[PDB]
Amino acid sequence: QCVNLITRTQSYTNSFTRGVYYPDKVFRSSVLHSTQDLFLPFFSNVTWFHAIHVSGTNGTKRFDNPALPFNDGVYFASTEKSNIIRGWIFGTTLDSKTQSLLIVNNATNVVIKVCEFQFCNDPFLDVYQKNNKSWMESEFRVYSSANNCTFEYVSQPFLKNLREFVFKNIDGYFKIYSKHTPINLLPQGFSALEPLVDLPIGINITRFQTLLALHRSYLTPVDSSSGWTAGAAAYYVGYLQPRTFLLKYNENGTITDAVDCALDPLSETKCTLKSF
């Protein structure tokens, strides 16, 4: 059953050079390559969201967690550890009228579906204790109905450790790129995102929503659930734009550097000269 739990705040931070991904599946080495497609511009103004569930409040005016626009593509980032972020929802109306794409990760698999979900206003996986040993996850608070399912995909899970994703929806394909990076402090430097899966779904996507997971709270082992344990999930969102990038491949074939041609005159000169 749908319940509103999440209060979301936002700040603004700098995407220095993150979001670069391999544009094709062709091996190149010791070469500079010029490409033109949807990239996250360097030093972009990305939004840092904090989704907070605090248990034991009063009133209902504090719950605000609306779905975000998809624009031309999304750069998603997180630095979470306790599996609080489980996946995503993509679609236009996020109800039974249209089709929507749901991605869920649970510790052994990723489930990707395209169905006419009647999503809840504040969807989240409900993790509850069974037999005082196991924890079971329910989708009854993610959607109320899933009908007319047209796509399904099961594989290994997608999800101090920064997790970066790039989602694009082009020519009937939902392309995902991923990277995991051990960090200490958005970092400096480069971490080229690698292709993950190309889903052949011809869906119209305008909005997306992050899917969390919440554990039920038990005051004592003899008591029932009194709600969900207080939680916090922080992530970063940026938006792709059509740009031309000069990517550098090293001897081993990895993308070690990039230049945003439209960023400023010096980078434009570098792109014109095809040199760094």
């Epitope: 059953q1 749908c2 739990l5 209902t60 509850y128 069974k130 009854f140 029932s224």
Partner: antibody
């Protein structure tokens, strides 16, 4: 504390209307749903529907075309309407509060409605 | 879930143990709640979340849930335990009740 109110006699092919008033607490909470459960005399319990502070509703599929529930947070009330009633709708109706919308902790006293001409 | 099956009647001698069974597809994957209704009154929850007793319920009420079967066990059954017991589950978008079991105490 939950109290039901409404007519106890309804003509067939007319509208059954009930209202539950809540005291000692506020409907304006995210932790509870507010539902209706009916029981024919001598028979079992059947859940009619549940409503949320924001107006989100769940309905019994066998009555979804005839059931409509509304919520009034200012007055701490929630109401049920059932159209095109027949004798099969003669029963005792409880208004209940549903912790997390999955169980019942407090029931109403129950009001008996008879559908007859 | 989506279908709960209950025996219509269970008869037990005083002081013995009464077992009321609820059957459904993959009940072990969902919480089951037990309600007791005495004649002329409103139901009261005796068990929540398959094994939890709310406040005020005698310690002789116990619950279990495994596979496709949920069990409500009353130990040292007394005359006052003579009532109607219902199992309840929440499926995707509906609340499902059992048919109800009438507990009779012999002797």
């Amino acid at each position: 504390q939950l109290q039901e109110s409404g007519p106890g006699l309804v003509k067939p092919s007319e509208i059954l209307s009930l209202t539950c008033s809540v005291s000692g607490g506020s409907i304006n909470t995210n932790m509870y749903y507010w539902g209706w459960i009916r029981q024919p005399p001598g028979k079992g319990l059947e859940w009619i529907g549940s409503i949320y502070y924001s107006g989100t509703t769940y309905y019994n599929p066998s009555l979804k075309s005839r059931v409509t529930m509304s919520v009034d947070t200012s007055e701490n009330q929630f109401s049920l309407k059932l159209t095109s009633v027949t004798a099969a709708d003669t029963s005792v109706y409880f208004c209940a509060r549903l912790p997390l919308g999955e169980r019942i902790d407090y029931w109403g006293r129950g009001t008996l409605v008879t559908v007859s001409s | 879930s989506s279908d709960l099956t209950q025996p219509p009647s269970v008869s037990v001698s005083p002081g013995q143990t009464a077992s009321i069974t609820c059957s459904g597809n993959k009940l072990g994957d969902t919480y089951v709640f037990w309600y007791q209704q005495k004649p002329g009154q409103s139901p009261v929850a005796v068990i929540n979340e398959d094994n939890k007793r709310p406040s005020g319920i005698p310690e002789r009420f116990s619950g279990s849930n495994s596979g496709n079967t949920a069990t409500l066990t009353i130990s040292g059954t007394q005359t006052m335990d003579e009532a109607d017991y219902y199992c309840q589950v929440w499926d995707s978008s509906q609340m499902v009740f059992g048919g109800g079991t009438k507990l009779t105490v012999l002797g």
